[PDB]
Design a protein around this ligand. Structure first.
Ligand SMILES: *[C@@H]1O[C@H](CO)[C@@H](O)[C@H](O)[C@H]1NC(C)=O
Ligand code: NA
Ligand code: NA
Ligand code: NA
Lengths: 494, 47, 48, 31
């Protein structure tokens, strides 16, 4: 316990992080010198770092850094169109997290986050069916993104951990800051027999991960949290969260009791058909749970305060039914100096729900007017894509976007379309004017059901890694896979 | 068998596969650049 | 001519000089650091 | 040169020990 294990950890860190960085630096210097030699040869023959100062001095590894959005400089003067388009290749990012070959086990609900130089990953292993199967385990991985000899970026796991008492956990998510990872999990009320009572609320658990240290556990329950509405059940959005200062931010959804009047948001285009005000009634009933007006499914911002003190507290802000549809999984993003929220589609609207807020407040959130990612898989809804007819249906799927500009005018996403056998998937980039640049991906794979994207700066370019869940062949169990691509800027002139 | 064994397997994979591939790719790139340098020398300093 | 020596502009980090812990009731105090010809010695105390 | 210091990154963090490195440079000014 005293000698072998720390030295084994040191060897793992040195062989998986340090040496690849040294070799990559050597290669970079070599190429720079070759370019200089070529320039000197052409010129001669006939017939120190203030910017890096206070920027990379405190970083352990300098392979990746937070994204810095592209600018249209140079593109502007001639009549021109500045656009960003996806790379041709979709390289593998192998061994992002441990896996198994058992046939009775399904890997589900991935959570992926990228910090300054570290990444946080989470997965659930459920016996039998993916959705209503017993939670066998919940696995968390903390690692680093490093540059090996391959074309795309690679991942080096540094710490693998298993959440204690996985049976009494409703759902949970991860967040990543510099040299730090956070996992917020929600537990349920268990009593009498050891088997937990499904879909109940009993507080939270907060786990803090740092490199070459031990995980720290905090119990937030009782008087340490104050939700604005009485919640019977609370789930944490699988998208993840962020850290700003000493405080963290997540998204939550669950059953909440109310007694006020309900006028659910009803936006749709020329549905016609029956109409006559029955669409409003359908919209109001959709947000309800089991018909009763008392209980709704609500979305909420969740804020964790004073994480460094050692006594974290939690507050929340609930979206009114008039400003949202039925609750679902979500994600919190930091864009520039302002923040964004993505809400997955559950129910009839199957358009993209993204919003931008400067202070993470319910009353100061504005929603994008874009429909580009439309969920066409894992839905029982029958309404057409052109016009979304209010109906009662359930959609269970997750496809988020990553903003490539301060106002989220540019973004990147992944589209999945059902077919006779499995699905067909593409990666797309959406620009200001309304154009989509698409490349088909994963042709060999049978089916893909979800995707989450996180981008960063790698070798003076924007690179993104997408974590998907699916089946390589028809009879294989569902697993989770990671791939990498690049976003390249263009200045087309018409 | 909970911590040490997976790390040993990861170290074996790192030392047996990844690092040799990185070093071989470096050498391949270096040889290509040397060939280009020779070609440019012959093309330009011919006089 | 003025011969002078001045400090450099960057303050780099030297990670993992010695082991650390994430406990909140432990304080690391009183370091003793020395550099030899090729080796270095480091010493710390943990107090509660 | 290498410098070893005591301190806390945040106000409510426990005390720890950190280490950083710098270069001393020869200079020759002319007046
Ligand atoms: C401006 O666009 C027109 C076509 O829309 C094109 O013919 C012209 O070359 C463009 N101007 C320049 C100088 O690029
Ligand atoms: Na050279
Ligand atoms: Na060369
Ligand atoms: Na050469």
């Amino acid at each position: 316990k005293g000698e072998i294990k720390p030295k084994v950890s040191l060897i793992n860190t040195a062989v998986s992080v340090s040496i690849p960085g040294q070799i990559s630096n050597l290669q970079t210097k070599f190429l720079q010198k070759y370019v200089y030699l070529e320039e000197s040869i052409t010129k001669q023959c006939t017939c120190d770092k203030p910017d890096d100062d206070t920027t990379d001095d405190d970083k352990v590894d300098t392979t990746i850094k937070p994204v810095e959005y592209y600018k249209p400089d140079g593109c502007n003067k001639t009549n021109d169109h500045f656009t960003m388009q996806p790379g041709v290749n979709f390289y593998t990012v192998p061994n992002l997290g441990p896996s198994s070959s058992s046939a009775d086990e399904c890997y589900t609900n991935p959570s992926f986050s990228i910090g300054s130089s570290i990444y946080m990953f989470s997965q659930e292993i459920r016996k039998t069916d993916c959705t209503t199967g017993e939670i066998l385990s919940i696995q968390i991985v903390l690692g680093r993104i490093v540059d090996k000899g391959q074309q795309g970026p690679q991942a080096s796991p540094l710490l693998v951990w298993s959440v204690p008492n996985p049976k009494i956990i409703n759902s949970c998510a991860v967040a990543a800051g510099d040299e730090t990872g956070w996992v917020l999990c929600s537990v349920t009320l268990t009593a009498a027999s050891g088997e937990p009572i499904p879909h109940m609320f009993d507080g939270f658990w907060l786990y803090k991960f740092e490199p070459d240290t031990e995980v720290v556990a905090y119990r937030i329950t009782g008087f340490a949290y104050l939700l604005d509405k009485v919640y019977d059940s609370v789930f944490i959005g699988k998208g993840g969260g962020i850290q700003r200062g000493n405080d963290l931010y997540f998204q939550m959804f669950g059953l909440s009791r109310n007694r006020q009047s309900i006028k659910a948001l009803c936006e749709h285009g020329s549905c016609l058909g029956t109409g006559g005000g029955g669409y409003q009634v359908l919209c109001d009933r959709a947000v309800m749970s089991f018909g009763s007006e008392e209980s709704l499914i609500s979305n909420a911002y969740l804020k964790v305060n004073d994480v460094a003190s050692g006594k974290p507290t939690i507050i929340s802000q609930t979206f009114p039914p008039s400003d949202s549809y039925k609750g679902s999984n979500g994600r919190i993003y930091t864009i520039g100096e302002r923040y964004g929220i993505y809400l997955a589609p559950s129910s009839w609207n199957r358009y993209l729900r993204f919003g931008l807020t400067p202070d993470i407040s319910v009353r100061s959130t504005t929603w994008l007017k874009e429909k580009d990612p439309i969920m066409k898989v894992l839905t029982t809804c029958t309404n057409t894509d052109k016009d979304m007819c209010p109906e009662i249906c359930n959609t269970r799927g997750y496809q988020d976007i990553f903003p490539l500009s301060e106002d989220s005018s540019f973004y990147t996403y992944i589209g999945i379309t059902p077919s006779n056998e499995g699905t067909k998937s593409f990666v797309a980039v959406k620009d200001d004017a309304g154009h989509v640049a698409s490349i088909t991906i994963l042709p060999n794979y049978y089916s893909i059901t979800s995707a989450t994207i996180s981008c960063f700066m790698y070798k003076e370019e924007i690179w993104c890694i997408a974590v998907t869940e699916g089946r390589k062949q028809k009879e294989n169990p569902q697993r989770i896979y990671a791939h990498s691509y690049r976003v390249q800027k263009m200045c087309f002139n018409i």
